[PDB]
Design a protein around this ligand. Structure first.
Ligand SMILES: O=C(O)CCCC[C@@H]1CCSS1
Ligand SMILES: [Cl-]
Length: 322
């Protein structure tokens, strides 16, 4: 039943908007697989601090496009040596955070293309010979989700390290016949492995082609979100207290203003994954007494599996107040 979309743009902002738009107009009838390629860019996780993750002056110098995605996780640098994939599907009860199930077909395709021993590790990365060639993230909204990931074929690894504040390319591990492909050919071969065919003509009717009504709405998302300075960089947090810890589920970085024993301002940054927006947690804490019992009580009704995957409510409250 799956369909596919090959994005034509080389702009990360248009490609993310396309994914956003396709998730928001998905039918249960057909899940999608998306493939997209873009020019030098950095993509921030949903709750990351732009100013701490990127060397902005260097990105500015080199014309590296900065944006922010809807999924959690960390910062990624992409260039024309990367292809990104996305599985857009109806969310089953167990599905969110199950990177093993969602990356299985990519691993199997890569194994078939000669990259044997490729495996999932650190929960959301794909490794080969102990080295990361892919990071993955998930987003869900209203029972629909995507899992999207990078595949480093011929990324400039030096540039990755320079613009962000063990990794590897796939090319050396693939069979000889796949070792001198264009990034487009690499993408197309992956696609063919996923649908278990020899040529694209065997699945041309499974392509979904973006209409002009689609393109118009995507254009609006780029203006309002993915190219929007307010969305990308966010407002400066007002704070005198910073609490940062690494948990099983990633880093949480909390910035607080406390006055007369009450929380007046709170900003939460991190690279955790989440089904729901962190803004709801912040809204519940504003004006609350800055003490464990009062903070816990304010968050009593929240299911923390929804807000911070693999970080407990107790951990979070202790972070805020210890
Ligand atoms: O590994 C992480 O922590 C984040 C990975 C995010 C992958 C996204 C793919 C399409 S845009 S960036
Ligand atoms: Cl909980």
């Amino acid at each position: 039943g799956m369909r596919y979309v090959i994005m034509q743009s080389r702009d990360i902002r248009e490609n993310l908007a396309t994914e956003d738009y396709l998730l928001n107009t998905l039918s249960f009838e057909e899940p999608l697989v998306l493939f997209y390629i873009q020019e030098p860019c950095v993509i921030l996780g949903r709750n990351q601090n732009a100013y701490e993750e990127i060397d902005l002056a260097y990105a500015r110098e080199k014309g590296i496009v900065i944006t922010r995605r809807l999924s959690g996780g960390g910062a990624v640098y992409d260039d024309l040596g990367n292809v990104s994939f996305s599985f857009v599907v109806q969310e089953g009860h167990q599905a969110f955070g199950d990177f093993k199930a969602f990356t299985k077909p990519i691993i199997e395709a890569l194994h078939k293309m000669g990259a044997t021993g490729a495996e999932i590790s650190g929960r959301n990365d794909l490794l080969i010979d102990g080295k990361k060639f892919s990071g993955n993230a998930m987003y869900t909204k209203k029972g629909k989700m995507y899992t999207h990931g990078t595949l480093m074929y011929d990324v400039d690894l030096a540039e990755v390290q320079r613009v962000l504040t063990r990794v590897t390319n796939l090319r050396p591990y693939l069979d000889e016949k796949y070792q001198q492909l264009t990034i487009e050919e690499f993408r197309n071969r992956l696609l063919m492995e996923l649908f278990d065919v020899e040529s694209l003509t065997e699945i041309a009717e499974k392509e979904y082609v973006l209409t002009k009504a689609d393109q118009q709405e995507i254009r609006k998302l780029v203006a309002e979100v993915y190219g929007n300075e307010a969305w990308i960089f966010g407002e400066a947090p007002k704070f005198t207290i910073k609490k940062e810890e690494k948990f099983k589920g990633g880093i949480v970085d909390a910035r607080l203003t406390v006055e007369k024993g009450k929380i007046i301002e709170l900003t939460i940054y991190g690279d955790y994954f989440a089904k729901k927006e962190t803004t709801e947690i912040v809204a519940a804490l504003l004006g609350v007494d800055y003490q464990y019992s009062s903070i816990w009580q304010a968050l009593a009704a929240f299911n923390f599996e929804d807000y911070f995957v693999n970080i407990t409510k107790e951990e979070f409250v202790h972070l805020l107040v210890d």
